[PDB]
Every structure is written in C-alpha cells, then in structure tokens.
C-alpha cells in the first residue's frame, strides 16, 4: 500500500514515525524535501538528508526515481547522511566546523529540528552497534565502553523525562537501561552471570540517584549524548565503502573506466566531511586521496567509478553493484556541494534535480540577507532569484533600494518578491514554464512596489566557489 519511509523522529506535534507516499513516481529529493518540511527542518539544512535502503545497505542518489506500486516493498529511512564530526565543538583535540560568516549569526551547521533528528538517529545507531563491544580487546577498553554505555543510557532516560515532563523515576520504570545501550552489550549481559546482571542493575540505579532536577536542559542532554557518541563511535557519521578493485592512475598515461568488450571486497574507501577521501586494503593505515575541493569531476560507467583530482591523478574503483556506485558517487558529490561549490555537481548521473534546474535557470540557494546585499550593492538595476530560507517551494526575486541609515550614512534596503509554482510572480498576471523563461521576460522590465520603481537590468548569477552560509567551513 505505497512507499513507507521510516523516520527516527516525527518532528514537533509528533504522530507516526513514517510517511507514506502514493504518487506514481517521485524523486528521492522530492521525498526528502517533503519529509524535511513536515519535520521542521529548514531549507539551509535540506541537503544534509538522504534516503537509506536498510536492506540493500545503499543510499539513494537525490535524482533516484521512486515508483509506486513497484517500490511499495522498499525499506527506506530518512536520515542525516552529510555529517561533520565535532560540529558541536566539544572535543578540543579536533577542529571546529561552521557555515561561512557575512563578508568583512547564521554560522551554525544545524537548525533545531535537524539537531533533534540527529539525536534521535544517534540513539538508533548507538543501540544498533555503530560502536560494538565485540571490537574491543583489553580489560581497560571493555570496562570503559560498558561504563560509558551506562552513562549514555542515563542521558537517554534524562532526555525522555524532560521531553515528556515527568520525573526520571517513572521513565526508568517504563524504559530499561538495556534498551538504551548497544545490542552487543545487551547480548553480553544476557549471556553472562546472574550476579553481573544484579551488579549492572545497581550501578545504573546509582547513576539515577546522582541526577539533579534543574541542572540540565533537553538541548544540553542531547549535545552531551551526541558528543559522547562521537567519542565512543569513531564510525558514527562516517561511511566506509567496500570496493572490489582499486587503482591509482595518472591521467596522461591511461583512460580510467575504459569500455572493454563481481568479486569479494579488496579495499574500503572512507569518506568523511572533515577528512575527505581515504582508503585501506581489506599494519593497517588509511591512505589519503584528496579533499572534496580537489575533485574536478567523477566519472561513473556501469559499476566503475573514477574520481579525478586537479593534478590529473585518478582513484579508479569497482563497486559491488550499480546501486552501490550511485550511493558512493552521491556521497562524494554531496560533500563537494557543502565544502567546495554550492552551484556545481561532479557527476550528471546523481545530480540533484532542483540543483540542475537552479544551474540552468540562474537561481541561488537559500542565501542569508548579507550575502544577497554583497551581490546587489555594486550597481543600480541589479537583481537576483534565490530559494527561500524558510519556505521549501518558494523562490525570492530580490532588488536593492537607496536608503539612509541612522547617522546619515547611505545604506542599502532589500525588497523581496515571491515566485510560486507554472511559475508565477505574486502581482504579475503572466505564468511561465520555467524560471529561466520567467527571468528572460523580466529582463528590461520595470518593477513597481508601492510608490517605488526598480530597473531589472541584470540578474546576478551564482559564481563557482563563491562563499555563503551554504558553505561549510572546516576549522
């Protein structure tokens, strides 16, 4: 009965942690935008999210065509895919992360709803062994992991107490610490001694007694939980991709992915927001390939991927399937968008449809006010179109007006007009097929707002590598 997309959080208001889609065909992007909006996620945060196929263990590229009834049996989760370790800035041993600030706040990576979704997703991955007890060897590491997992289960229940507005003791009786710890630790407890069970129960009941009502807020419990999860789980917020073949090649010595007239994994390629692209064979050490800003393009031919660096060196990869190659290319392309270029994509095979449209129609992403001002200020008659920073389906046509700030010093006043979709500008009797068509008609015309007039002389276009709040700066 339709495509059921699973949620880790239903957003404010709540309800069923899923969204069912009945439309004959939809893109993965349309799905994510619809869900992001329902959950309260804002437009500057939309591109952090993607759809994960939990059974096939692949993510969908944003141009993936979902079809109903054909895909009614797919098990998909809506999740944060693009992650920056230490974004909260709680580990001093690693750099900070922020959105570009105004020229010469809006610098925070996440909005309130993206943070709460991240926390709910983190709890799911934690319980699902993103950090396994089995991966440990020494008594010191095992003891630390168990004690930390109990502290995490304590934070999990404290949050629930605050969220539902009930004391910690009534939460502790409805929810067990065993349901808030990694599954590998839960299995360990069950298989081990009855006296060890009694002891862990008493250690946890003690953790509950050292709780102070009014000491911490819901937000502080969440940040600490997430920051502890990062410390416990080095794999959390990262992706390790298995490949069947891996080669490094210099371009002026051969063509990669060449058409010629699958096997067990030989390597893993690691991709992280703060560390770029690394690899290792399956004594172990991650070799470094490049950062996202070093990539010129990515070539995808069947299940074969080629990552091209500016110096013409290539990382050639054979993935287990076409769906695995599309998952992988959309991971590299998604981090490239966030760290290097808001208005470019590395491979047409996985390009976000809303971005392809934006590039051809000369539309900017959800830019904050100081970035649009820096674009309109050079000349009179300048204008631009950008996606709204609050509304997912609204475009903003913007002009700058002569104004006088307090002191008598000449200032700049912005006038914002909405374009809605068959794109229509609110106040103009015409209707257009594309925004490029609506913008081409706009060229040379005169805009009237109250008693003021504005010459629509030139449309500012997105420039390659230009900094804005859409760019994520790695400290």
């Amino acid at each position: 009965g339709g495509l059921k997309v699973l949620l880790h959080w239903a957003g404010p208001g709540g309800g069923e942690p899923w969204v069912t889609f009945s439309e004959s065909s939809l893109t993965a992007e349309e799905v994510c935008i619809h869900i992001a909006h329902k959950v309260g996620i804002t437009p500057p945060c939309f591109n952090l999210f993607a759809l994960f196929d939990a059974q096939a263990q692949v993510w969908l590229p944003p141009n993936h065509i979902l079809e109903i009834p054909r895909d009614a049996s797919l098990m998909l989760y809506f999740r944060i895919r693009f992650y920056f370790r230490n974004w909260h800035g709680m580990n001093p041993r690693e750099p900070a992360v922020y959105r570009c600030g105004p020229p010469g706040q809006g610098m925070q990576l996440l909005d309130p709803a993206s943070f709460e979704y991240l926390f709910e997703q983190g709890k799911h991955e934690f319980v699902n062994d993103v950090a396994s007890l089995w991966e440990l060897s020494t008594e010191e590491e095992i003891h630390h992991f168990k004690n930390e997992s109990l502290g995490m289960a304590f934070l999990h229940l404290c949050h629930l107490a605050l969220r539902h507005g009930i004391p910690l003791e009534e939460v502790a009786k409805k929810t067990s610490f065993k349901d808030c710890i990694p599954r590998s630790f839960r299995r360990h407890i069950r298989q081990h001694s009855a006296l060890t069970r009694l002891r862990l129960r008493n250690v946890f009941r003690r953790f509950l007694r050292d709780f102070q009502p009014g000491r911490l807020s819901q937000q502080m419990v969440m940040v600490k939980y997430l920051a502890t999860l990062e410390r416990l789980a080095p794999r959390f917020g990262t992706e390790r991709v298995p490949v069947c073949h891996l080669r490094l090649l210099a371009q002026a010595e051969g063509e990669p992915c060449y058409i010629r007239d699958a096997g067990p994994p030989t390597h893993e390629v690691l991709v992280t927001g703060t560390g770029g692209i690394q690899w290792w064979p399956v004594e172990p050490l991650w070799a470094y390939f490049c950062d996202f800003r070093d990539i010129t393009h990515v070539v995808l031919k069947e299940h074969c991927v080629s990552i091209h660096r500016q110096d013409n060196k290539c990382l050639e990869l054979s993935l287990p399937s076409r769906a695995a190659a599309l998952s992988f290319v959309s991971l590299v392309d998604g981090y490239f968008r966030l760290t290097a270029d808001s208005s470019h994509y590395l491979c047409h095979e996985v390009a976000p449809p809303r971005l392809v449209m934006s590039i051809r129609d000369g539309i900017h992403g959800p830019l904050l006010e100081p970035f649009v001002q820096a674009k309109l200020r050079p000349e009179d008659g300048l204008y631009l179109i950008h996606w709204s920073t609050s509304h997912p389906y609204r475009l903003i046509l913007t002009v700058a007006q002569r104004s006088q700030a307090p002191d008598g010093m000449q200032s700049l006043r912005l006038r914002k007009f909405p374009i809605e979709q068959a794109f229509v500008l609110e106040g103009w009797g015409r209707s257009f097929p594309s925004v490029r068509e609506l913008g081409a008609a706009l060229q040379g015309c005169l805009l009237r707002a109250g008693d003021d007039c504005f010459s629509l002389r030139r449309c500012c276009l997105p420039q390659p590598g230009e900094t804005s709040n859409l760019i994520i700066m790695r400290g």
Partner: peptide
Amino acid sequence: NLLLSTSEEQIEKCFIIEN
C-alpha cells in the same frame, strides 16, 4: 546559540511594466 536561528523573508506585493 548552538543552533541556526529562523530567517523568514518579509515579502511584498509586485507589479510589472513591460517593454
């Protein structure tokens, strides 16, 4: 502080003169 503040555009009613 930790999180992205809301930013809604104040939008206005248009009128276009052609040629």
